[PDB]
Amino acid sequence: YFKIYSKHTPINDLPQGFSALEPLVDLPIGINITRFQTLL
Amino acid sequence: LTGTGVLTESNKKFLPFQQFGRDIADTTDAVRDPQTLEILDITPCSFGGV
């Protein structure tokens, strides 16, 4: 079931080098996701 | 998690989401107290052939 993992990081085009993401959210909400969109 | 050991409060750098940690054997090495932010190492009680 649903998760979020994430990280906020400094930069000077998605860069080379390495990073690691901690979990934030983990939810048994059971949503049958197949499509998504972004909000500005 | 039932077990037995020397419960020593410990310097193991648990990240905030990490509830417990494992040894190379997949046995539990350390836990967080479910009532405190303290991280406890679980050393096996001393053993040895006689």
UniProtKB/Swiss-Prot annotation, chain B:
It comes from the Viruses. Changing T2K: In strain: Omicron/BA.1. Attaches the virion to the cell membrane by interacting with host receptor, initiating the infection. The major receptor is host ACE2. When S2/S2' has been cleaved, binding to the receptor triggers direct fusion at the cell membrane. When S2/S2' has not been cleaved, binding to the receptor results in internalization of the virus by endocytosis using host TFRC and GRM2 and leading to fusion of the virion membrane with the host endosomal membrane. Alternatively, may use NRP1/NRP2 and integrin as entry receptors. Binds to host ACE2. RBD also interacts with the N-linked glycan on 'Asn-90' of ACE2. Cleavage of S generates a polybasic C-terminal sequence on S1 that binds to host Neuropilin-1 (NRP1) and Neuropilin-2 (NRP2) receptors. Interacts with host integrin alpha-5/beta-1 (ITGA5:ITGB1) and with ACE2 in complex with integrin alpha-5/beta-1 (ITGA5:ITGB1). May interact via cytoplasmic c-terminus with M protein. May interact (via N-terminus) with host bilirubin and biliverdin, thereby preventing antibody binding to the SARS-CoV-2 spike NTD via an allosteric mechanism. This is Spike protein S1. The gene is S. The chain holds residues 546 to 595 of 1273 of the full protein.
